[PDB]
């Protein structure tokens, strides 16, 4: 399911080495290490990012992202 | 075979850790992680990319790309 589509407001490297990202109004985290430079790139360049998961409440995990 | 040649229209990072890309009008996926940051850059700057493979239909895998 499409959980939030927009520009990355802020991003955060976490102490367990996951990567949180804030899109639309809600925070989402991922354990995927490859996604880290991909997301920070999408942030800096203002790419439209859409987060995809099976649970969409703010604070959920994801391992699927569309990069427009 | 040259399947598609053009700009990366969009790109998706997938739950199986593969990377999907959309060139001309067709989607293509690669399981090679090395191709992830190279392809996202080609998309950033509208580099003309050309996907090479043996199966050229939408939904097919590749592990060969020419960057122009």
């Amino acid at each position, epitope marked *: 399911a499409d959980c939030a589509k927009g520009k990355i407001e802020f991003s955060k490297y976490n102490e*367990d*080495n*996951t990567f949180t990202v804030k899109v639309s109004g809600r925070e989402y*985290w*991922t*354990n*995927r*290490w*490859n996604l880290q430079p991909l997301l920070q790139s999408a942030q800096l360049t203002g790419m439209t990012v859409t987060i995809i*998961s*099976n*649970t969409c409440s703010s*604070g*959920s*995990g*994801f*391992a*699927q992202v569309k990069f427009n | 075979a040259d399947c598609a040649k053009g700009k990366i229209e969009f790109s998706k990072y997938n*739950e*199986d*850790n593969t990377f999907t890309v959309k060139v001309s009008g067709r989607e293509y996926w690669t399981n090679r992680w090395n191709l992830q940051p190279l392809l996202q850059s080609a998309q950033l700057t509208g580099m003309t990319v050309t996907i090479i493979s043996n199966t050229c239909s939408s939904g097919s895998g590749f592990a060969q790309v020419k960057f122009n």
Partner: nanobody, 121 residues
Framework: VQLQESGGGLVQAGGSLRLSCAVSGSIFRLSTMGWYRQAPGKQREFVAS???????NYRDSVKGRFTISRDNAKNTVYLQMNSLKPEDTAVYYC????????????????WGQGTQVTVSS
């Protein structure tokens, strides 16, 4: 790294139990959290699992009656088992499998101590 399981015990057939398993923070978000069970004289088999992104999978015999969930805040997994049958009697183990695409130790699998469920006639 600790996996603390709890809940489970005796229950008459058709009743219900909520198994819960509490994981270290270091490993929770990195893991598909599973529940495996071992019936005496048989081998440990899959029951359910939920990935970091909430993708749930169940053994066929358990669809409709069991339902697994995450609470990312409390770092715990819950297996809610409804309308239990005696075929469900076993030792249930919590599993923490580190997902493809992320890394912790050389350790790619962590297990709970075990916890006994008996469905009782």
């Amino acid at each position: 790294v600790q996996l603390q399981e709890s809940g489970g015990g005796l229950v008459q057939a058709g009743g219900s139990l909520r198994l819960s398993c509490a994981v270290s923070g270091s490993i929770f978000r990195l893991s598909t959290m599973g529940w495996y069970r071992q019936a005496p004289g048989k081998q440990r088999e899959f029951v359910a699992s939920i990935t970091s992104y909430g993708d749930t999978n169940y053994r066929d015999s358990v669809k409709g009656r069991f339902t697994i969930s995450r609470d990312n805040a409390k770092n715990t997994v819950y297996l809610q088992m409804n309308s239990l049958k005696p075929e469900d009697t076993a030792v249930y183990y919590c599993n923490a499998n580190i997902e493809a695409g992320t890394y912790y130790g050389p350790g790619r699998d962590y297990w709970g101590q075990g916890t006994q469920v008996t469905v009782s006639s």
